[PDB]
Amino acid sequence: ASHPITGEIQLQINYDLGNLIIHILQARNLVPRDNNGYSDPFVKVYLLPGRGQVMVVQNASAEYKRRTKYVQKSLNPEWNQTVIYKSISMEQLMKKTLEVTVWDYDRFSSNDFLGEVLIDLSSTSHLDNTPRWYPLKEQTES
């Protein structure tokens, strides 16, 4: 079988004190799979022109997720997390692009792809902390 990459991702961007902050929220219209609810999808966000630092997103209060993971975790998973990249000025920042990538855990440990977005910080109008949706594309390997 195969799973096509679809859906989008919602996040909040904000840069302050020379530090780039990014908050993860959730994704919608993701790739459906057999047996609803089984694995908690995670995201990876790193700058293109950086040191290759991939920051994975954590899961919010499972207490509230455990009740929503039913259909959400299956089609639209959330995270509601926050990350920062200190030591980054608008000079190099504008040159860097925030790439949000969704990944699902395997049955043993591996991680499958789910979606990839590219947010150019050169014009990131969502800097003023604004929850906006971003289209998740596929990871082409030419």
Obtained via which technique? NMR
Distances in whole angstroms, Cα of residue 98 to Cα of each of 15, 27, 31: 12, 16, 22
Rounded distance between C-alpha atoms, residue 58 and residue 81, angstroms: 7
* Partner residues linked to 79 by β-bridges: none
Rounded distance between C-alpha atoms, residue 104 and residue 115, angstroms: 10
> How many CA atoms lie less than 13 Å away from 58 in the CB half-sphere?
6
The tokens describing 90, both together, are 């608008």
Strands 19-28 and 8-16: antiparallel
Residue 16 assigned as binding residue: no
Strands 42-47 and 55-56: antiparallel
Phi, psi (deg, nearest 5) at residue 26: -175, 170
Chain centroid offset of residue 76 CA = 12
Q: Which helix (H) or strand (E) holds 34?
A: none
- Structural domains of the chain, ranges and CATH numbers in brackets: 1-142 (2.60.40.150)
For residue 50, give the amino acid letter.
Answer: G
- Going across the sheet that includes 42-47, the strands are 55-56, 42-47, 97-105, 111-120
Residue 128 assigned as binding residue: no
Residue 112 assigned as binding residue: yes
Residue 109 assigned as binding residue: yes
Q: Which residues, including other chains, have CB under 8 Å from residue 126's CB and lie 6 or more apart?
A: 11, 12, 13, 119, 132
